[PDB]
Amino acid sequence: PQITLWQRPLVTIKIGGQLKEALLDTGADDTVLEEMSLPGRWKPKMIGGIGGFIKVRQYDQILIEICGHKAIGTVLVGPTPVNIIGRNLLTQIGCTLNF
Amino acid sequence: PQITLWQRPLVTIKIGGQLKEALLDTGADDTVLEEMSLPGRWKPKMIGGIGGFIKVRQYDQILIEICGHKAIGTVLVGPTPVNIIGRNLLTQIGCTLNF
Ligand SMILES: C[C@H]1CC[C@@H](O)[C@H]1NC(=O)[C@H](Cc1ccccc1)C[C@H](O)CN1CCN(C(=O)CCc2cccnc2)C[C@H]1C(=O)NC(C)(C)C
Numbered sequence: 001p002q003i004t005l006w007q008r009p010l011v012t013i014k015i016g017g018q019l020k021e022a023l024l025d026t027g028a029d030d031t032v033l034e035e036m037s038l039p040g041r042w043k044p045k046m047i048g049g050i051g052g053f054i055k056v057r058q059y060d061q062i063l064i065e066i067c068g069h070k071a072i073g074t075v076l077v078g079p080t081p082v083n084i085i086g087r088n089l090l091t092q093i094g095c096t097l098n099f
Numbered sequence: 100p101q102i103t104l105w106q107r108p109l110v111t112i113k114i115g116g117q118l119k120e121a122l123l124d125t126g127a128d129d130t131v132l133e134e135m136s137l138p139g140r141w142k143p144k145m146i147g148g149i150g151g152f153i154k155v156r157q158y159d160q161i162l163i164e165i166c167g168h169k170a171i172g173t174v175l176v177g178p179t180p181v182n183i184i185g186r187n188l189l190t191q192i193g194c195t196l197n198f
Contacts, residue, residue, distance in 0.1 A: 001197070001198060002195050002196070002197050003195060003196040003197070004190070004195055005125060005186045005189045005190045005194060005195070005196070006186075006190055008128070008186075009125050009126075009196055023126050024125055024126070024196055025124070025125060025126030026104060026108050026122075026123060026124055026125045026126065026196075027107075027108075027122050027123075027124030027125065027126050027127055027181075027183060028126055029107070032149070047149065048149070048150065048180065049148045049149020049150040050131070050146070050147070050148035050149060050150060050153060050179060050180075051147055051148055051149065051150030051151030051152055051153055052150030052151060053150055054149060054150055067198075069198070080149060081147070081148065081149070084126065087104040087105075087107070090104045090198075091103070091104045091105055093198050094198045095104060095196060095197065095198040096101050096102060096103055096104065096196075096197050096198070097101070097102040097104070097108055097123055097125075097194060097195070097196060097197075098100075098101050098102070098194070098195050098196075098197055099100070099166075099168070099189075099192050099193050099194040099195065
């Protein structure tokens, strides 16, 4: 797919059998999802955004399907404005910026 | 060019004669730059993201050169930790997301 940026690059992701909307974000190093229950243990992580830092819970080896493309990696869960798909998962699905 | 996401998508921009390094961010609706002096009248604006909201100065119709490509648009100036090139200018240089 080729996605133009006249609108927000929102896609549907499936995680835990649920469909959610997520923002393809090249300016995000990590993938940060809104509050939800993920399996296993979690480790602590502090991430800095535009307004400062927030504490998130990191889960490893989580399966997440982005537009029919399966990816397995680190997902952070916390008080985020929207579900964000960062570079860690963007590289797994073969996403690039072109101009 | 084609830019991979293994590393942060940083590019050189020229604004007001000054050369700066900025991030090509598809998740950003706007373009926000670190504190600097731009000519003209500005308007106070409040923008938010991870960590909360920050107060910025809104300058309209500013010309920026992103890798030679010229683009005109609104640029917000404020306490951002990284210079961000958002969707408002990314569209002007024909930037697209592919996978
Ligand atoms: C993802 C994080 C993990 C670690 C960092 O990588 C970090 N990345 C970022 O936060 C980067 C900036 C950064 C890069 C590198 C180092 C430090 C900081 C910004 C992000 O790509 C864009 N971001 C997405 C989520 N957003 C939304 O949904 C807004 C919705 C909304 C709703 C109602 C009212 N207002 C807003 C806010 C938006 C943002 O910040 N946009 C502006 C115009 C402010 C820049």
